[PDB]
Amino acid sequence: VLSPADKTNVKAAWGKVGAHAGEYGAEALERMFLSFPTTKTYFPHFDLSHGSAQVKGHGKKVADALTNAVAHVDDMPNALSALSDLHAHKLRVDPVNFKLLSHCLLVTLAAHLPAEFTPAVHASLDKFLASVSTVLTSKYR
């Protein structure tokens, strides 16, 4: 569960992400494709090369969804509802993959936000990405 302190931590860190979000989501995806190749199976229709405009374009979409989750941190299950139907019922993405993307996001934020990624903030972000993953995954079978 996201406690008050966690929400504050998440708002402050995503805040400092600002207009770089799109770029971070794109790096997170590239990191995931390279470190965990099984995830590419969900994107055979994508151009997966370094610099791919499809990957940047998508990274932006992933970051906007997270920004909207942060904006609706007290009602994530409803705010991400459409994205849950998409992932669980249409794309049918196995839940382990969410853990992999999440890990890759944390890696990206760590590499770009040295001063903000303290122990406490790292724990809050991990918790937040778990909450998002759980919502996107709850109807899956």
Binding site: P37, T38, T39, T41, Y42, P44, R92, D94, V96, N97, Y140, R141
Partner: protein
Amino acid sequence: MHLTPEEKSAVTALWGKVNVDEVGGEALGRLLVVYPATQRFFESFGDLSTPDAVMGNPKVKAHGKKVLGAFSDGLAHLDNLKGTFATLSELHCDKLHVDPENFRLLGNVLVCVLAHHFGKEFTPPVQAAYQKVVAGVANALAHKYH
């Protein structure tokens, strides 16, 4: 495949009694019914709208048999599952785009089917030996994913 001699022998002796037409169809069918997500890979098989529809589908049954057919090969090559399954691996990855996490689901369904068919004879020790085999097969099938 860290299989003790009494394990290899446990696996082998039971496999000799498997009706591949029944088990193969039951395992593939139970996968699609128990884990419906997997149905996206067989949309070309027809109607899989209900359990009965699924267990009766002749494309499900034939494919099930081929699947068990491949599993039999691995049992005869337990010492080199990797080499034995390299082509199938490349296929499930480059042509079919199957997330290897699904290989475990089929393995466990497969184990539940063996137990359903053999009852008392599918003792805990025999189960453990099959869990190792099924893990080894899953891993071998995932080896060439890139």
